[model samples]
Target: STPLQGIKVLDFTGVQSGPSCTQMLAWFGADVIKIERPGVGDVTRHQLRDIPDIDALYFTMLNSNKRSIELNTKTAEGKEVMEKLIREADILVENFHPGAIDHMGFTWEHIQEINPRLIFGSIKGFDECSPYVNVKAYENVAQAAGGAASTTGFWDGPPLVSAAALGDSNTGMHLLIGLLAALLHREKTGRGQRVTMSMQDAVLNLCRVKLRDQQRLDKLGYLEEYPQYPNGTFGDAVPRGGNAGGGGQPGWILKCKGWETDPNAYIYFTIQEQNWENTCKAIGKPEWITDPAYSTAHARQPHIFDIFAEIEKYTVTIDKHEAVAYLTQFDIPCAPVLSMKEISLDPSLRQSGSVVEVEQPLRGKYLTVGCPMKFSAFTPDIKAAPLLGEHTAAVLQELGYSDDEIAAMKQNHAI
Candidate 1:
């Protein structure tokens, strides 16, 4: 059985943030029903078209394991159906602009009056006083304003965005925290309260440690761990460490022999005090361990990147698998950076179910990533995202609406 086998989610959510959160809930067996506009449906439905008329990969990836229902909350009867959903749902999640739902005639007060136990999850832009508090923000916009871009790339290079979709996905994680907290609170009070998160807050929270460093600019030392280029830690706040390990472990990505041919022919290698001498030796730099310009962690601390370059000089001769296997034998910590293709097809991932295949009626077999959560008794089940209006009639029937009423509502574009 799934963890949320009996939970019901009234997912009045569209686009990335909200759908991603509700999709995660659905993974654990929550019955999530995505409400869309009667005819046009969610905007993401047309955002990035893959097959012209079918749902795009962007929508599918962000909104898996749920059903979509066409419902025009603009009509009076449709409002009645929405009210019934509020009465029966455990949660109602949405990512509309602030005050949009309240503008839809279902204010927080009205929603609370109907089902006092309903946990209403909302996603907004800023945290408290987010930089773009007055307007909306896109992926890179949030990254730029939220501190990711500024603290990412090399110290001297242009600010670079991370390879992942941190904005939408992090907001999803932030909402996860809020919903879990609300659920726990509901257990205590027998009532639910409003829970909210924003991409601004999520990104800021992720960048908080860097921001904290900005507040304290006096601390610096030549430790055995961090050994970035220039041999010393230098920055008013946090210096963009390039691809080097940022958590103080001191690592970097090295291109292997097959890098020109194989996409996954790269591995991250680290160097610490305990393994410093050995790492240098393995990289065929034993003399540097005693040389004044490179001997000891402090001596090499100022030229950390150069030290890794020396390692990379040797790594370039072998493929990632061979490089990892050889370096690991000598106590160096390293692993290949697998792409989506390799990750999905990896034999190890098969048992863990990291990336899975789902059979969607429209898209046939496609890859669906399983949640990064595991349990002994309750494993997650990933389902394909539904076509727009796929469950409109069935869900409306569950709300006690008659067949004729559904037909009428359909005719008026108010499913």
Candidate 2:
């Protein structure tokens, strides 16, 4: 009943990026066999543990619904086991450093000879063609290099990186897209191809709007939608506009009644030209509805902040929820700036399966984000991540290794 029931994924990924993709594949019913170092498993298993000795939430959250196996790929016996896995696997994913796989004696060319139909997926810090290909990269590094940080913060402030996993998980999602496409192509060609993505490329793809702004500023001299348009000056490159909306209709984060006490007591309020009269009425500024100085978007350009200030005056009298409720009645786009605590406690998210609670054998009950994609025909059965090398014997047995051989391998420290 699942989409990928027949698929076998040899997961050679670690940390956030690679694990994130394979976890989704597992949720969709792929039999993901995660390979790990012989003694230590994924490094995240012990990193940032909330409970002493338990697998960290970082590991559990990203590695759910998969099996873990330990193997010393440095050992000759281990290479034989890997060759068998490659031959049987439908897909093989890795996020190791540039030549890690080659050092393991499993280059792309070698892999193709073993399993020409295996989809080989990879994620790296930079593109193979990039000048910084040898440099190591992390989440913020990719954001800075890919143009996100430079165009994200206030005009006068330093470049800021987003809290979102733009480099790691975003690259993982991009690799998933390529892998799925490769699967489809393989159906027609009867051969699988390499699918690779870089963190810099993934971050740049998401920051495409800033690229558009760059071209616009190059030709037009200024971007009218940006906060710098009417008052501030423009440099050669795009400057961060803070919380200003990036579309034609201008918007800002307005303070709500409890903003003085609560940092997130705010709402995003947009002023649309089409709904000018409604916006005026909502904020008790009906007089501005027909006034030539404030009637049109063009007329209000110079005094946009002044209009926002007036709107904030009304918003400050009500809570964010109440403001959004009232604004939505007039067809205005608005939302309360909910904090992480608020989102975690939201019953609606739980009801929609966006937030899920699962029980682990050792960690007990814990919460995680469920799959976001929904299909009418199928729903994912979420499961907890495996313990370290939890399925080594079972998986090895499936590969036709007898119990005596498995015990010998275990004794020899090959698994």
Candidate 3:
């Protein structure tokens, strides 16, 4: 059996941030009951639809291995059913805008009263004390406010937010860590606590090195590894760090073969202290191994652009993967930038079950990312996301509601 096999989660969340966390709990073998609105369901179910009358990939990917129950929590019967669910739930999670849950009549105080042992996890754009707490935020908004966009792009270009779901999904992962810690704490105290995470805080945590540079810029006057060190002027905050490694290691994303046509045909190579001589030899610049101007990491810092240009002379002649293999013989730290299509079809990832194919009745055959956490005792069985409200009847019956009672509730648009 899985570690969380007996846990029951009342998932009062929608969209990516909350669904992503609940989905992981479900994958870990918790019975995650997703409470959606009665008729419309999760907003993502129709947000980015490609095919008519089908659940979009946006919903399906983030919401796998969870049961959905439609309940208009505004209605009296709906609130009653929700109260019953909460009373039996081990965890309750939601990611709505600030005050939405309180407006629904189930404040944190009320929830704890219903089940003192319940772990109440909430995801918001900001904490309750912040001035921006009430302001609604989406993925890019968090990135912009959290120091990521301030230090992400090329020095010549405007600040850019990352393509990854750092603001939404990463925040969920952060909340997952907090929730697990709260669960562990509950085991000792025999009582549960509120676990909260802010999207801005999560993104800022991931962009921590930018803050490191911010401190250095105040005292050190210049960050030598930064792109603006020798040429461009400094700014109030740390400037964009294009492909620079976080640890002040001089690294660059150099073009590889097919880069003229393929945007992602590149490899990031780092020149660190240990591999300095080997790196020079790998790029056929053996003379530079002994040259004082380019020998050590610190010495090569100012000449990073020139060093990377020389390395790219060799890299551009070979494929990205070929460069990765060739440079690896010298123990040079490098990686090829694989595109999404390449990653999806990668043999190694597929063999390790990081990606898998699933079949559903409505969508037929589709590919989805599998659980990454591999346990020796518990391997997750990836499955298609349930259709909207598909498990409502079964869940209600299990909760001791009769068929006629469910019909009456449904007649009243309550569930």
Candidate 4:
């Protein structure tokens, strides 16, 4: 019942970006073979170690349901083994620096010659045409370059980066889309093609709303919904509006009971135009329903903060959960602000398989995020990530190498 049961993936990705993509493929049932360096595997194996000498959570969480094989591709025997893998692989993924693969002698032309049907997927720091194409980018660097950081945080504060992996895992998700599209294209053309995603571009894509605001700011000279409209000054570029809503509905993160002590004792409250009356009534402001200064969204823009201040009076009397439960009765758009710890313990996420607990041989029971995509006919059978070179001999045998041949290759550090 697996969607990609027969597909074989040659995973040459490391760290987060590339591994995130191949892990999804593996979850969808691809036979993902993770090629690692001999003796020194993926760098994440030891990164931020919680248990000494064991694979870190950073590696295990992103690399589950795949086979690992050690290979010294610098060796002649290793090149031969790689060539064999290329011939058998349906897809090949890598996130090396620009031209690194070419330096390894596996040019695009050479790879095509080896397997015309192989879909080559790559992740880069920037677009091939970008001036920063050669520049290395990490998560925060991409966020800064892609416009998210410039538009985040309070206007008075320095530009801020989001904790979300907008550059790394996001680009991996983008690559996954391109790879899937390439698979469909191959089915039609009987030939595979290259798929590439740039981390900067991926971050930019996620911050598209900011781009829209930028264009709007150019034409309108002022953003009515922005907190800077009436009371604050506006520069040429979009200024950060703190926790103000970015859409048509005017919203803000208001404090609830225990906010003085609890960082996450807050709720996002949106005053939808259609539910304006409901919002006013829920906050015990029935008198303001038809008051001209407080009635329409346009009229209230200048005093949005004042209105929010009044709403906070009610919210501060109750916990976030109670505020949300009470507000929903009026059909108001609102939600409690949940922390990571709350999400981790949420029963709904566990029942939906979004957060899964896996038992690893070395690390014992550990939690990992499971596939977000749901299929009615199938559920992924989550498994532990493979150990370094755990399947090297078996994979070499599958590639037609005899036991002695494998032993000889191992002796020469060819793996």
Q: Distance (Å) between predicted and true CA of 102, model 4? A: 1.4
Going through the candidates in order, what is the number of backbone clashes in each? 5, 0, 0, 0
> Clashing residue pairs, candidate 1?
230-302, 231-301, 231-302, 231-303, 232-302
Ranking by lDDT: 4, 2, 3, 1
Residues 294-327 of candidate 1: C-alpha lDDT, one tens digit per residue: 7666666667777777788888998788888999
**Candidate 4 lDDT:** 0.93
State TM-scores per candidate. Answer: 0.92, 0.98, 0.98, 0.98
Q: What is the lDDT of every predicted structure here?
A: 0.80, 0.92, 0.89, 0.93
**Candidate 3 structure quality by residue, lDDT tens digits, 292-319:** 9987877777777888898899999999
* lDDT, residue 339, candidate 2: 92
Report the backbone clash tally of model 3: 0
Judged by lDDT relative to the true structure, which candidate is superior, 2 or 3?
A: 2
Regions more than 4 Å wrong, model 2: none
Model 4 lDDT per residue over 1-415, tens place: 7989899999999999999999999999999999999999999998998999999999999999999999988889998899999999999999998877787779999999989999999999999999998988988889989998999999999999998899999999999999999999999999988999999999999888988999999998989889998888889998888898888888999999999999999999998888889988898888999999988998999998999999999999999999999999999999999998999999999999999999887789888999988999998988999999999999999999999999999999998
The better-scoring model by TM-score among 2 and 3 is 2
**RMSD (Cα, Å) of candidate 3?**
1.1
Alpha-carbon deviation at 268 in model 1, angstroms: 1.4
lDDT of model 4, residue 414: 96
Candidate 1's displacement at residue 300, Å, is 1.3
Segments of candidate 4 deviating more than 4 angstroms? none
